Amino acid sequence: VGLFGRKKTVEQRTPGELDAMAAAGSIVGAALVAVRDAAKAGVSTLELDQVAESVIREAGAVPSFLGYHGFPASICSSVNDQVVHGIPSATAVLADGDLVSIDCGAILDGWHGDSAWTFAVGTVIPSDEALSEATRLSMEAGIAAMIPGNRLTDVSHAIELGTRAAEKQFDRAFGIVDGYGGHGIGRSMHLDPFLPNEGAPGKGPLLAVGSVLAIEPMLTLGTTQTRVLADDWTVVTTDGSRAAHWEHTVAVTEAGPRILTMRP
Ligand SMILES: [Cl-]
Ligand SMILES: [Mg+2]
Ligand SMILES: [Mg+2]
Ligand code: NA
């Protein structure tokens, strides 16, 4: 089997299809903003879930994470050394100094959007601020590589180069999370090709106008290795270092990359 799927080109959406995906993605965007406002010291991650879920439903969409291979919530809420897939719960209470990653997806009229970001509760630790900003820059670096005629791993390589520049910018070593990455997305949340956050340029399928990928760098302040907790979902750094996660669903167009999961 091919690591990157069967198709020579990442499936091209039409302009109407991209608008339909962008309407799903604005809802995810709206959900992320509402969750971030609600996310104060003393609030539980389950309260955040309820906030995200309402926003999704009141806009006429459905949360794509809910019941997804058994996942119990509408968001992942991963805190500090938790990387991805944190399960919202009444006993995960946010405290001042926490680093919070929120991951969210929605479906509207059969089309998916998937986005994530990381922010601080209260006043951010300086190492954490650099971590989250480096992750965001790595995402932006990947997004800028979404041009017609590039190949999949040009995006991977641009993400990685963005990570190393952010290292030089912050005088800090960042661990690129091993074994997790982005993906194609459209009528389902997860489609081929898997998108690495690092690797040699010029491999995997071509990008063309209309091709969409979910671009999602994950960085740590230490190791590149992770394990899964006994809850079977929550992913944590093996060394206890904190981690960040940023993501957008992004289309290649004639006029340059288009974020389909825009925030209000
Ligand atoms: Cl996949
Ligand atoms: Mg996501
Ligand atoms: Mg994703
Ligand atoms: Na984290």
Side-chain angles (χ1 to χ4, degrees), residues 1-57 59-167 169-264:
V1 70
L3 166 70
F4 293 130
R6 277 157 204 99
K7 297 295 190 225
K8 294 204 272 211
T9 301
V10 166
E11 195 180 319
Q12 293 175 75
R13 299 274 66 98
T14 70
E17 284 172 357
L18 291 178
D19 289 345
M21 288 184 71
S26 300
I27 292 162
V28 179
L32 289 185
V33 173
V35 166
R36 180 171 180 161
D37 284 341
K40 311 304 174 158
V43 175
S44 73
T45 58
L46 187 57
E47 296 167 77
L48 302 185
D49 186 56
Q50 296 167 6
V51 172
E53 187 176 7
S54 290
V55 163
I56 289 164
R57 304 195 185 280
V62 312
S64 57
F65 289 20
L66 186 67
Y68 186 66
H69 296 286
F71 191 79
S74 300
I75 61 168
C76 312
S77 56
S78 306
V79 176
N80 300 329
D81 55 314
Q82 300 176 344
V83 180
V84 290
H85 310 164
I87 300 174
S89 104
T91 68
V93 178
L94 301 179
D96 207 79
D98 282 346
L99 197 63
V100 179
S101 311
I102 308 294
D103 189 358
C104 185
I107 317 174
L108 180 70
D109 293 338
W111 293 103
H112 288 255
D114 193 10
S115 184
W117 64 357
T118 298
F119 50 88
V121 173
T123 70
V124 60
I125 307 178
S127 60
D128 287 5
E129 182 179 298
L131 174 65
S132 186
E133 197 60 16
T135 306
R136 184 188 71 76
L137 292 159
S138 304
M139 185 194 61
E140 291 301 339
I143 287 165
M146 293 285 285
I147 57 170
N150 267 5
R151 288 191 174 269
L152 181 75
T153 69
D154 301 327
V155 185
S156 309
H157 191 61
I159 293 163
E160 176 178 19
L161 289 179
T163 299
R164 305 316 177 198
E167 281 190 337
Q169 175 181 339
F170 292 116
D171 194 27
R172 221 137 207 149
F174 296 118
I176 297 179
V177 170
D178 185 18
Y180 293 84
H183 50 90
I185 177 167
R187 297 183 200 243
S188 301
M189 193 201 312
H190 292 130
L191 293 168
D192 295 327
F194 169 92
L195 172 61
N197 286 312
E198 59 182 339
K203 308 174 181 189
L206 286 147
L207 310 174
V209 176
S211 295
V212 178
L213 297 162
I215 297 178
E216 51 174 333
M218 289 153 284
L219 291 189
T220 78
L221 283 164
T223 186
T224 67
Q225 301 311 279
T226 63
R227 69 189 180 91
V228 182
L229 292 181
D231 70 14
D232 295 340
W233 285 98
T234 302
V235 176
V236 303
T237 64
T238 53
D239 60 3
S241 59
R242 293 181 169 195
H245 175 206
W246 280 75
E247 169 186 39
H248 270 309
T249 303
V250 180
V252 174
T253 77
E254 275 284 313
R258 171 172 174 197
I259 294 155
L260 300 184
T261 44
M262 302 287 201
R263 287 174 283 266

